[PDB]
Amino acid sequence: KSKLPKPVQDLIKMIFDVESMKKAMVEYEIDLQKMPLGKLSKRQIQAAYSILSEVQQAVSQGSSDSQILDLSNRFYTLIPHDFGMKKPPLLNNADSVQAKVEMLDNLLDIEVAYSLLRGGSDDSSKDPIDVNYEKLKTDIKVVDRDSEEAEIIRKYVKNTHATTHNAYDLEVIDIFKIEREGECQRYKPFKQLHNRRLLWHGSRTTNFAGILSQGLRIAPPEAPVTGYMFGKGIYFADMVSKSANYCHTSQGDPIGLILLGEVALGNMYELKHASHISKLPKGKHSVKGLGKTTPDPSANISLDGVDVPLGTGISSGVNDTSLLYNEYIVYDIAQVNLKYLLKLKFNFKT
Numbered sequence: 001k002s003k004l005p006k007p008v009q010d011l012i013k014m015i016f017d018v019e020s021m022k023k024a025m026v027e028y029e030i031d032l033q034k035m036p037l038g039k040l041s042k043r044q045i046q047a048a049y050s051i052l053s054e055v056q057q058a059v060s061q062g063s064s065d066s067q068i069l070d071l072s073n074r075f076y077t078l079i080p081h082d083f084g085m086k087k088p089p090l091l092n093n094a095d096s097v098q099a100k101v102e103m104l105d106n107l108l109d110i111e112v113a114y115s116l117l118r119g120g121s122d123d124s125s126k127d128p129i130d131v132n133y134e135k136l137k138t139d140i141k142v143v144d145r146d147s148e149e150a151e152i153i154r155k156y157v158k159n160t161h162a163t164t165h166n167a168y169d170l171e172v173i174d175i176f177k178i179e180r181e182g183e184c185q186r187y188k189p190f191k192q193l194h195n196r197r198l199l200w201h202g203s204r205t206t207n208f209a210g211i212l213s214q215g216l217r218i219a220p221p222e223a224p225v226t227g228y229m230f231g232k233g234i235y236f237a238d239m240v241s242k243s244a245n246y247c248h249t250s251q252g253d254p255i256g257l258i259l260l261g262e263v264a265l266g267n268m269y270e271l272k273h274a275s276h277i278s279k280l281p282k283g284k285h286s287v288k289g290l291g292k293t294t295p296d297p298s299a300n301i302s303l304d305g306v307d308v309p310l311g312t313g314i315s316s317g318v319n320d321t322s323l324l325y326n327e328y329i330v331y332d333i334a335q336v337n338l339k340y341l342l343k344l345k346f347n348f349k350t
């Protein structure tokens, strides 16, 4: 039977949970009778991205109904929904396109996960636990409850947890010291670049299967530039309360995952407002969206050269920014080196 530690085995059970996948699709009113998990395809999703893209472009021009109407149906025909009765939500605005653009991202990770889960080892020589662990291609170790790292991280989860978005409370149940296969050599070169932070990264649980497998990727061109405030790229944060809002957990699903990947930002291109780009100025290596709140810089610590902004949340120099939380963006998957993976539990007060 399995040799891996219980805590790790449990992790392998939620990231490969089919119910979680179906439940994820049901939230999108996706009639599972027309689009089963085994019906999902990457070629189908891209075709969808293109449509959404054509939609956004249309809205920015003013197609004036019709073209948008048919362009809208062209989507729900490719992505089977079940609105019962009303009028299939017309994608005639940025907000509608962003929501849809967000659905494809998750559905894509689910497609990837559903694939791995069903590799080529349906035998019984090895239990499902130890088998699926392989498909991840990421060595996973459990971090003791009472250790330096644990304390640092857990303390990094407490401080950066303000009272504003305190509609819940975080509790570090498990802490893992992950490290995907290859992110070591691929990150070695960029490792020689000053300003290396240990930022947060949250995402739907049904996506970590693809995250550890594929690794934080950058949205493809077929994908709508809408939604992203700084263009296609990898986004992080220093306020654990900023990434948490991306785990999409709830009173019913309190358990969510979050990452702590080391990122060599180098010379940042500080911005206060949204600005779709993806062509940083000659000299910069990353973008930083100035926010109203920021971890107490005086209480910041740094280890192995990596900076850990585990300082209590305070007011930043400028408040004349649409962002209330910082936001670091890198446009090269090779600049990120996932380090930890927390199995946090959300406790809502209501």
Ligand SMILES: CCCN1CCC(c2nc3cccc(C(N)=O)c3[nH]2)CC1
Pocket (backbone or CB within 6 Å): 098, 101, 102, 105, 200, 201, 202, 203, 227, 228, 229, 235, 236, 237, 242, 243, 244, 246, 327, 328
């Ligand atoms: C279609 C994608 C839409 N939209 C999804 C969320 C993305 C996103 N923006 C972020 C800013 C700070 C932190 C995180 C994080 N995951 O921890 C962020 N994820 C930005 C793009």
